[PDB]
């Protein structure tokens, strides 16, 4: 297991029993908090929102907005085999025992579609044994010998120690203090997220993301819609900006069928594997800029050479700036 991340000395003293999320100092000013399961999470905002929640996050068609939740409290366990052979086949047994015989099948491994079901606690080590349901689980397979598991905090430890009964054969990283996540709901959700993300190079997985951010009824999309790429520091933009999407307005049901054949497998795997390695995401911080130097960089745009542009977003350097891996 891992301890609380070091930070400000004053505010790391109060986390002796209940930890903090990255946004706690922001939410605390605008919500009602509680304390459960070792976290200080958020319960509800300070306004009545019974109907607005329904008509912006429900299954209605009157949605003109989105709902974002900071779900960092859900842990993340990155389990992977160490036989050095990509075929694995022993992590398969562990995952098939942990849940019912569901999350190790051709639909979930090869097609790498997300899984949601119920997770048990096997104890078969001496004669009589049984199982007792524990709760929900999110298992995602990668390259047939890497798995990512997302769990509610309450059942985080009980399953974890179970895997520790076979750490002779696997390896586990309690990365719940190193990976964060956000959940988005609503119709105009991807439209808002795509207004604050740009890339470094040209990648097809951003072309698909640009095209599919114009659906407004996400129930039409197929089972699998994974995106994965490398973004730049979002502080460059200084204001959210559309994707110039109004030009193209003839999306039909024939280009959707292309999304099931034109799948960029290698370009997803390469950018994904920069999250299951601590030193890679350590390099991801290689040079994180302070606010003042970004301000000075932006100020240096009032004397540019084109002299007929009047740009606002700062440029991007080829090697002296970090690249943020990102999965959706």
């Amino acid at each position: 297991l891992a301890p609380i991340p070091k930070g400000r000395v004053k505010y790391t003293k109060r986390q002796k029993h209940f930890a903090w999320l990255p946004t706690h100092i922001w939410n605390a000013k605008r919500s009602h908090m509680m304390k459960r399961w070792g976290y200080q999470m958020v319960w509800a905002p300070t306004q009545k929102c019974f109907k607005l929640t329904h008509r912006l996050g429900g299954d209605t068609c009157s949605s003109d907005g989105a709902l974002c939740m900071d779900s960092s409290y859900i842990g993340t366990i990155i389990v992977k085999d160490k036989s050095n052979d990509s075929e694995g086949d022993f992590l398969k047994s562990i995952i098939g025992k942990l849940t019912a015989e569901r999350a190790n099948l051709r639909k979930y491994r090869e097609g790498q579609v997300l899984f949601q079901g119920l997770i048990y606690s096997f104890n078969e080590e001496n004669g009589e044994d049984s199982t007792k349901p524990l709760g929900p689980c999110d298992v995602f397979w990668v390259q047939k010998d890497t798995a990512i598991i997302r769990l509610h905090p309450s059942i985080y430890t009980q399953v974890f120690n179970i895997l520790l009964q076979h750490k002779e054969k696997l390896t586990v990283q309690d990365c719940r203090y190193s990976l964060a996540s956000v959940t988005l709901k609503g119709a105009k959700a991807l439209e808002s997220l795509a207004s604050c993300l740009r890339s470094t190079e040209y990648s097809k997985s951003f072309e698909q993301f640009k095209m599919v951010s114009m659906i407004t009824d996400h129930n039409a999309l197929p089972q699998r819609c994974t995106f994965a790429f490398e973004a730049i520091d979002p502080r460059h933009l200084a204001a959210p900006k559309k994707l110039n999407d109004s030009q193209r307005k003839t999306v039909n049901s024939d280009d959707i069928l292309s999304l099931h054949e034109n799948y960029p497998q290698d370009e997803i795997n390469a950018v994904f594997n920069e999250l299951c390695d601590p030193e890679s995401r350590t390099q991801s911080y290689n040079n994180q800029n302070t606010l003042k130097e970004i301000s000075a960089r932006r100020y240096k745009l009032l004397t540019a050479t084109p002299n007929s542009i009047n740009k606002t977003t700062v440029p991007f350097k080829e090697s002296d700036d970090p690249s943020i891996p990102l999965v959706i």
Binding site: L302, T303, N307, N310
Partner: protein, 121 residues
């Protein structure tokens, strides 16, 4: 000398009035919805007065044209949010004073704009 030196001694009054009004009532109006434009207006005025603060014209780059988009891109907002304080009805001296100041600033900014045509680039 009339092309310049007759407007600058008017921005020299506008900036002082803005600074006094700023220092006067920061505490009780921090969380309102119009500093997000008021401080922007003050900063844009400051970035203009600082240039040309001497016996000749030390002007290598005439590109403060780029710093004179406070009258095409972000001038409707300041006008359309300084009247909401008038409509809401709890403070009315502030709204009228802000509207007068905005009118003065826009007039002076164009007065500086048209008389210069050295944008031959």
């Amino acid at each position: 000398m009339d092309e310049m030196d007759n407007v600058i001694r008017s921005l020299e009054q506008e900036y002082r009035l803005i600074l006094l009004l700023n220092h006067r009532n920061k505490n009780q109006h921090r969380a309102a919805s119009w500093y997000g434009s008021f401080n922007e207006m003050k900063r844009n005025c400051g970035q203009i007065i600082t240039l040309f603060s001497r016996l000749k014209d030390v002007e290598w780059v005439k590109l403060h044209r780029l710093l004179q988009r406070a009258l095409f891109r972000q001038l409707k907002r300041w006008y359309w949010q300084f009247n909401g304080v008038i409509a809401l009805g709890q403070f009315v001296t502030l709204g009228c004073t802000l509207v007068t100041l905005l009118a003065n600033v826009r007039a002076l900014y164009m007065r500086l704009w048209e008389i210069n045509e050295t944008e031959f680039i």
